[PDB]
Amino acid sequence: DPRHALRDPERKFLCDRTLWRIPFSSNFMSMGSLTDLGQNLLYANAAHALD
């Protein structure tokens, strides 16, 4: 309208039926079922706690 109350946009997104993915890869890419990490000696022969 030529005369109008002011505004301030609100943004959002809806992602239905979607599992968020955080792959255990060093570059986040999917270059094989057995990922890059999970084969490194850092995570293979040692024991680590996840928080």
């Binding site: 599992l19 993915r21 999917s30 079922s33």
Partner: peptide, 28 residues
């Protein structure tokens, strides 16, 4: 049967071959 190719459909005078054995489909 020693010649396993005898069990395949024959395109001409040769069996219809091809491919790949096994599946790697797993994610999510």
């Amino acid at each position: 049967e020693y010649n396993y190719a005898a069990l395949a459909p024959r395109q001409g005078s040769r069996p219809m071959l091809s491919s790949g054995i096994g599946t790697h489909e797993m994610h999510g």
